[PDB]
Design a protein around this ligand. Structure first.
Ligand SMILES: Nc1ncnc2c1ncn2[C@@H]1O[C@H](COP(=O)(O)OP(=O)(O)OP(=O)(O)O)[C@@H](O)[C@H]1O
Ligand SMILES: Nc1ncnc2c1ncn2[C@@H]1O[C@H](COP(=O)(O)OP(=O)(O)OP(=O)(O)O)[C@@H](O)[C@H]1O
Ligand SMILES: [Mg+2]
Lengths: 222, 278, 289, 222
């Protein structure tokens, strides 16, 4: 229900970020993407994020296609999915607790269970002692996993994320994608992408590989 | 989610206060500027209103010096006293004795051509010589409406400079700390949600500036009272410039608050439209 | 020798950064231009009324009635004799025979004289009035003592008023320009720390903002000059009306070249100093050691 | 001659940045320090930058110590280091080529050679025709490559880096680290730091490890 068809984005500047793509994804499936440096992956998932337009073809998400969408409907779809970025974005001068809690206020729930849930999210990342601190204080991997937790909370119906543990301990990433699988245990579809091929050979996998805008450098290979 | 609607306002305000109380020197430095700017226009309104209280010096002179007949007759002058009261463009013809004449001040200034009324007045019981100098009317009418163009220009110029300064400062302040406007937006949230805190601290800046201007203006007028009371008693009168009425001061402050609020809309709209998916 | 080389590049991008985002830069230039306009605008009309300085005095003028019969040549010499005395803007002779006719048209008679002083204090001028009543052939010195003291009071409120307005407006201008420059400097910190962690001296990291402030000052000054000229010409519609009605030759000349030059150079200097002060705060802020 | 005696970092927030360490790096050496997530590696390297106060202990830079040093003296020292930072720092709204040329501009070197130098840097980093562009245009790996290029220019006598290949594919990681090896062949030193040691383990080096703010969880393994 995440089908793609003949899509490709060319910049007005002249560059062709995406040449041509067409495929489908089923509900509740784990996904992986790899490729070289110049491959368009962050752009690829940004298409789903829709800060831009397809520039070619069409993509359909459930009932409504992503292209030609009212701006008023944009929050009503962007508030259902948690994400994380290579250049993580965090609210400076606001501590970790509210930084994580943001989506809860976005939907709007009483504070007590909100603090309960943020506490619950804290242990799954092992940042118990960092409960009240400015993001500028944290060490490099710490804010990355903080953003990860930001995506974790509110049990999003779907997860996208970006390359996690890009600067993390190899051992410490183990429990991380373990938690990712635990999330996948429910009706949650994950679209993680990375370069560490070593650990993408363990569980169920799909290895969608992009090469210079070319959709098929690889296939299912499940 | 009406209960949450209340909570958004509550959390937004308290956060702003912490943000406002934090970084205090910069916030005060900003607030002082538009406070002192807001002082000028309403201060001039107060000044002109105060001189409006002393509204007898405009007419003051230019009383028709209708010479009563050389033969002394106070009764006839007293009899003709009341007729002038009936007619417009005048106030009252007060009868005077030899140590005769009767005079009346106008209300407007008119110009040359309204002395036909003076010639018409020189047809009454006591008419020895109608006396109403013209050239004074000319000079006075030249001075006025010249003052009116002058005040018009100052008013419009100063209103424009105030509007520009407040709008520009709010715009630049909103342009800074941009990261929030997107970091909240992509993960979700609505226009009002992101908009509210920016409304709040702008309202606080406006309130603080409106308060500061009150004290500045009151102190300035008290400083200047020294010469005005001196000349007031000196001329043989009692007219000293008075203090700030609270009724006007509250209207002063609320204007600043609403001005900050509308500036918040204007500044936020540019960025919100800019970051459109397009 | 590279000192010259660094300056040239700092201009090119500054102009480039100027035209990038032109509407906002124009908006900022306009605000401080219109603010700069006002104090100098009030200053020029003071120069105008100074040029028309005669009417300031001679309105509450001091006149004297001499002895019953004073010789015409006596007064003709007395105007000059009092001319060496300070408080005579004018000293014009009016003989007895002229005074008779003058009173005849106004309505033996004392010869009158015309004396306009400079100073305005009632006490010194009334002492000089008693002296004018102690002249060799004067008889009485007509001075409405209420006129002279009223005149004395007239200066005081006016001078206090203008002093207060000037002292208010100059600091208002200082505050607005400094605050706006500080706000731009507070924007865009990231490059500051980027170069600082790379290295480079203070002047290298400083110059572009100084050029930016200078160009803002120049633009604001030019715009203020133009607006002031336009406003003076627009107001000029009514000044000639009184000149014709009373009969005179006063007209509000506008924007002499030297003063416009001074206005612009002051504006650019203010931009320079505001930029320097604003950058000093961040540079102090980012000092660990 | 790099040499650390007993020195540690205490943070004013009460947290302990670093307990105590004592090192000595000979001239021309190479280091591959690594550790777990919470290890103060980035803080450790920032200490050499002198952008942080030594706090508990004292530290030396060959002939002059890192302390009681003129702030005006700092830019001269920073001139001799082409460091790169994990959160790559790039001048937005300023072209890529000038972004690279900045250090040489600081040195006041003649313009005509600047273009040839920056072109020469491009092939080593494997980026063609991507100059004269804006940093916001590029992709994440491209930006990291840009930071590397900024680091490599002007032949720095000292080389510091932090988590290179933070998002690169292993192929590109190989060639760039080979370039670092060439720099080491030249009269330079390298103190790269990364969590991924599998790649570096193939090549002879000097792995140093720290944990829990302590000097060493593990010792030298030359
Ligand atoms: N706004 C843009 N300007 C210029 N090029 C762009 C832009 N958006 C995408 N591209 C091009 O698309 C290519 C890849 O897109 P993408 O961002 O998804 O790379 P990636 O998957 O994230 O890999 P990486 O960031 O590590 O380099 C980039 O190399 C870039 O040339
Ligand atoms: N300014 C600070 N104030 C207080 N504590 C700090 C400060 N900076 C770092 N710390 C603490 O010291 C610890 C180590 O800092 P450091 O940044 O060097 O870790 P790191 O080298 O970056 O490892 P990683 O990349 O995985 O995050 C951090 O986890 C943090 O808890
Ligand atoms: Mg680190």
């Amino acid at each position: 229900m995440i089908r793609f068809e003949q899509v490709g984005k060319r910049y007005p500047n002249g560059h062709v970020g995406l040449h041509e793509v067409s495929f489908r994804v089923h509900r509740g499936e784990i996904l992986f993407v790899t490729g070289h440096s110049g491959a368009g992956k962050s752009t690829l998932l940004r298409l789903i994020l829709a800060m831009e337009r397809p520039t070619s073809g069409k993509l359909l998400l459930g009932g409504q296609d992503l292209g030609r969408i009212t701006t008023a409907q944009i929050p009503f779809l962007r508030r259902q999915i948690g994400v994380v970025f290579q250049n993580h974005q965090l609210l400076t001068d606001r501590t970790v607790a509210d930084n994580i809690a943001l989506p809860l206020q976005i939907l709007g729930m009483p504070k007590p269970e909100i603090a309960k849930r943020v506490a619950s999210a804290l242990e799954r990342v092992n940042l118990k002692e960092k409960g009240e601190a400015l993001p500028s204080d944290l060490s490099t991997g710490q804010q990355q996993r903080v953003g990860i937790a930001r995506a974790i909370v509110h049990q999003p119906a779907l997860l996208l994320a970006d390359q996690p543990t890009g600067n993390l301990d190899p051992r410490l990433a183990s429990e991380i994608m373990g938690v990712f699988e635990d999330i996948n245990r429910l009706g949650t579809t994950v679209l993680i992408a990375s370069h560490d091929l070593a650990l993408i050979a363990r569980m169920r996998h799909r290895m969608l590989t992009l090469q210079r805008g070319r959709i098929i450098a690889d296939r299912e290979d499940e | 989610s009406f209960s949450a609607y209340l909570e958004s306002h509550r959390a937004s305000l308290v956060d702003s206060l912490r943000r406002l109380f934090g970084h205090p020197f910069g916030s005060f430095f900003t607030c002082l500027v538009m406070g002192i700017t807001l002082s000028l226009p309403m201060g001039l309104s107060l000044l002109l209103n105060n001189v409006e209280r002393l509204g007898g010096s405009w007419q003051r002179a230019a009383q028709i010096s209708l010479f009563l007949d050389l033969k002394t007759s106070e009764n006839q002058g007293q009899d003709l006293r009341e007729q002038i009261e009936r007619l417009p463009d005048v106030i009252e013809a007060q009868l005077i004795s030899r140590e005769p004449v009767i005079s009346v001040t106008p209300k407007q200034i008119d110009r040359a051509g309204l002395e036909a009324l003076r010639q018409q007045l020189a047809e009454l019981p006591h008419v020895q010589q109608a006396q109403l100098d013209l050239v004074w009317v000319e000079r006075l009418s030249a001075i006025l409406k010249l003052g009116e163009r002058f005040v018009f220009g100052l008013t419009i110029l100063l209103v424009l400079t105030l509007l520009l300064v407040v709008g520009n400062t709010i715009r630049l302040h909103i342009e800074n700390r941009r990261n929030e406007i997107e970091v909240i937006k992509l993960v979700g949230g609505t226009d009002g949600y992101v908009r509210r805190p920016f409304l709040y601290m702008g309202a606080l800046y406006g309130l603080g500036a409106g308060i500061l201007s009150w004290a500045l203006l009151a102190y300035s007028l008290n400083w200047l009272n020294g010469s005005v009371v001196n000349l007031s008693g000196l001329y043989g009168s009692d007219f000293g410039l008075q203090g700030v009425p609270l009724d006007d001061g509250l209207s002063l402050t609320v204007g600043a608050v609403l001005l900050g609020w509308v500036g918040a809309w204007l500044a936020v709209a540019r960025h919100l439209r800019e970051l459109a998916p397009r």
